[PDB]
Amino acid sequence: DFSAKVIQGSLDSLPQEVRKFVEGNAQLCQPEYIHICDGSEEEYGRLLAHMQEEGVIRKLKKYDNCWLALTDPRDVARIESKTVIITQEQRDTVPIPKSGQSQLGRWMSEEDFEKAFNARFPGCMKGRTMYVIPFSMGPLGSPLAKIGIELTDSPYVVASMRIMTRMGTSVLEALGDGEFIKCLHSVGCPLPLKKPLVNNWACNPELTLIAHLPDRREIISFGSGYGGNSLLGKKCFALRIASRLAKEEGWLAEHMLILGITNPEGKKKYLAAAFPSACGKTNLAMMNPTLPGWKVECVGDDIAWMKFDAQGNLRAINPENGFFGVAPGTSVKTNPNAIKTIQKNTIFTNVAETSDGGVYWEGIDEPLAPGVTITSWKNKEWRPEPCAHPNSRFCTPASQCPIIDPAWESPEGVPIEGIIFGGRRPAGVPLVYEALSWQHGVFVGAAMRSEKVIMHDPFAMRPFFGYNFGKYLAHWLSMAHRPAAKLPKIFHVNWFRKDKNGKFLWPGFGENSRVLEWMFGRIEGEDSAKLTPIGYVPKEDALNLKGLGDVNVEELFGISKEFWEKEVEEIDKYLEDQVNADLPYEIERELRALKQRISQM
Ligand SMILES: Nc1nc2c(ncn2[C@@H]2O[C@H](COP(=O)(O)OP(=O)(O)O)[C@@H](O)[C@H]2O)c(=O)[nH]1
Ligand SMILES: [Mn+2]
Ligand SMILES: [Mn+2]
Numbered sequence: 001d002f003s004a005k006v007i008q009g010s011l012d013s014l015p016q017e018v019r020k021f022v023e024g025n026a027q028l029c030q031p032e033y034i035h036i037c038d039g040s041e042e043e044y045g046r047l048l049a050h051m052q053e054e055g056v057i058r059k060l061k062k063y064d065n066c067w068l069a070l071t072d073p074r075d076v077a078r079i080e081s082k083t084v085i086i087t088q089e090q091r092d093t094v095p096i097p098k099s100g101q102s103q104l105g106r107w108m109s110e111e112d113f114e115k116a117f118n119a120r121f122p123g124c125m126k127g128r129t130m131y132v133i134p135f136s137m138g139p140l141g142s143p144l145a146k147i148g149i150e151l152t153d154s155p156y157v158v159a160s161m162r163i164m165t166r167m168g169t170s171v172l173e174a175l176g177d178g179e180f181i182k183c184l185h186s187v188g189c190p191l192p193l194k195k196p197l198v199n200n201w202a203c204n205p206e207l208t209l210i211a212h213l214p215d216r217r218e219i220i221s222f223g224s225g226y227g228g229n230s231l232l233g234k235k236c237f238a239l240r241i242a243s244r245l246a247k248e249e250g251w252l253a254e255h256m257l258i259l260g261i262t263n264p265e266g267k268k269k270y271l272a273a274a275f276p277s278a279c280g281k282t283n284l285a286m287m288n289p290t291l292p293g294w295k296v297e298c299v300g301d302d303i304a305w306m307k308f309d310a311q312g313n314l315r316a317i318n319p320e321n322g323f324f325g326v327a328p329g330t331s332v333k334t335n336p337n338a339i340k341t342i343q344k345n346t347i348f349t350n351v352a353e354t355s356d357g358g359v360y361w362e363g364i365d366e367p368l369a370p371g372v373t374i375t376s377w378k379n380k381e382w383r384p385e386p387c388a389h390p391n392s393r394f395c396t397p398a399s400q401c402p403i404i405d406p407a408w409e410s411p412e413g414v415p416i417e418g419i420i421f422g423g424r425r426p427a428g429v430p431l432v433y434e435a436l437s438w439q440h441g442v443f444v445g446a447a448m449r450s451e452k453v454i455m456h457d458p459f460a461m462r463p464f465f466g467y468n469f470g471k472y473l474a475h476w477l478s479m480a481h482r483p484a485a486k487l488p489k490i491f492h493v494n495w496f497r498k499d500k501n502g503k504f505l506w507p508g509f510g511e512n513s514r515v516l517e518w519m520f521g522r523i524e525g526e527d528s529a530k531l532t533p534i535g536y537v538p539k540e541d542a543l544n545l546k547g548l549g550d551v552n553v554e555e556l557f558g559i560s561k562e563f564w565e566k567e568v569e570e571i572d573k574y575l576e577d578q579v580n581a582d583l584p585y586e587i588e589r590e591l592r593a594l595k596q597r598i599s600q601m
């Protein structure tokens with residue numbers, strides 16, 4: 001009975017399966033104390049203050065309740081090399097690649113994982129508090145939401161989980177005897193410390209291992225205190241575990257923003273968009289449009305859970321409660337309404353701080369006053385190496401977004417009418433095109449490539465598939481064999497085409513409102529499209545380009561046979577090597593069709 005060690009809550013208060021999970025791991029990890037989180041502002045403020053006194057975070061004097069954490073530099077980002085999925089058979093997790101090295105995931109046997117686990121977790125929380133974090137991915141009471149319990153020895157994880165998920169006692173009461181995902185996390189630094197603690201940031205990079213066990217409904221993560229390694233809702237649950245749950249249960253879990261868009265006659269539409277990291281999801285989800293009369297409202301900027309309802313609409317919820325955005329590059333110009341979002345109640349990690357107690361990063365586009373001096377993310381004075389680590393983050397509540405859609409917490413989700421794919425392509429790929437069918441659109445997602453190297457990132461999910469990517473494609477195709485399904489139109493965009501001198505052909509940012517209106521009108525059925533080998537593109541003058549000056553539209557939409565011949569050959573060899581026997585017939589057929597259309601142009 002670990003009851004004697006409970007310093008907040010009680011083990012008798014917990015659903016019985018939750019108690020077994022806490023007590024079983026308390027016996028293994030041997031924490032000094034067990035703190036069952038209630039989600040209250042009191043608990044949150046007191047924990048931040050404790051971390052402040054211990055030197056784990058600093059208060060940002062300038063802002064209302066904002067905080068800065070600087071990590072050990074060895075613990076600065078997700079490590080795909082150390083991120084694994086455990087299943088009986090490797091092929092259920094990744095297609096067996098012809099070449100022998102899969103780019104589509106990382107499998108570990110159950111035997112190898114048991115060994116790794118036993119080498120890590122016994123005694124790992126000695127001298128530390130085990131925090132029990134009950135949380136909901138999605139609005140409380142939503143039929144699309146799912147519940148997890150995270151055990152962690154990191155107060156930084158507790159505070160960040162309060163922002164990024166719905167957390168606390170209300171979640172426990174709603175859970176009852178229902179099912180939940182078991183999330184176990186340890187920074188891997190029992191006390192007394194065996195190694196020196198760097199930057200007062202507990203970390204264990206040599207034993208870092210982020211493991212997913214879909215068949216046991218468990219995520220087990222060790223040795224990292226950072227971001228997606230430790231906030232186990234952020235990706236481990238939201239994409240890897242959930243995409244397997246989604247396959248079994250008939251829905252989709254995707255690396256997509258969700259935004260609502262309204263035309264000047266009051267008609268709203270919701271779009272989802274899958275871009276890879278650093279290709280502009282957050283910017284587009286919080287866009288300030290440049291075109292009069294248009295309104296963009298943010299539902300989510302990173303994760304979408306989507307399920308066809310009984311009437312055939314694709315209903316999407318944002319299962320997150322906040323935004324864990326990349327800070328560098330965020331500015332007045334590029335994302336003014338992210339700037340509004342983060343100036344209160346926000347945790348920053350690995351960005352710089354100004355003399356006046358503010359935040360600073362590359363691309364912030366903010367002249368400071370003469371005299372204002374800057375301290376780097378490595379806690380050293382800095383003069384124009386970057387000031388902020390490139391993967392530095394803000395962690396902010398979504399409720400604060402000045403354009404948060406009124407339905408962003410609606411338990412039924414919002415109806416998705418268009419899905420957008422895209423990434424960074426400096427050559428060959430036009431600004432926008434539309435897929436010819438659902439099957440072709442799935443192929444477009446599967447073929448996605450993104451930027452001195454161009455790499456495949458199908459569906460923007462390369463690091464996050466919870467199971468075999470060929471079966472994932474089959475799952476997407478199966479949505480069409482579902483009577484009533486109102487299959488959304490699929491588009492592919494490229495903000496990043498360059499001319500021969502390396503300059504961006506498209507100014508982008510809020511000017512992407514001009515591409516979104518075109519998509520709006522195609523969903524409406526407007527005849528604004530010209531058929532091409534890769535799909536539909538906007539007709540002559542269909543795109544509203546007034547105010548933009550003389551955009552060089554010839555090259556921005558130029559489709560070159562020689563380029564697309566190379567593209568389709570590259571895609572064929574990629575899918576053959578990496579997907580092989582698990583490539584669905586329909587995707588191979590779309591590939592043959594594209595190759596044939598290209599050969600005839
Ligand atoms: N050229 C151009 N750059 C963009 C655009 N949108 C975003 N970016 C840049 O892409 C980088 C990453 O953007 P972010 O929204 O954090 O992408 P995310 O990490 O995929 O959500 C930022 O430095 C932006 O300045 C655009 O429309 N055009
Ligand atoms: Mn620190
Ligand atoms: Mn983002």
Ligand SMILES: [Mn+2]
Nearest residue numbers: 477480481586
């Ligand atoms: Mn089919």
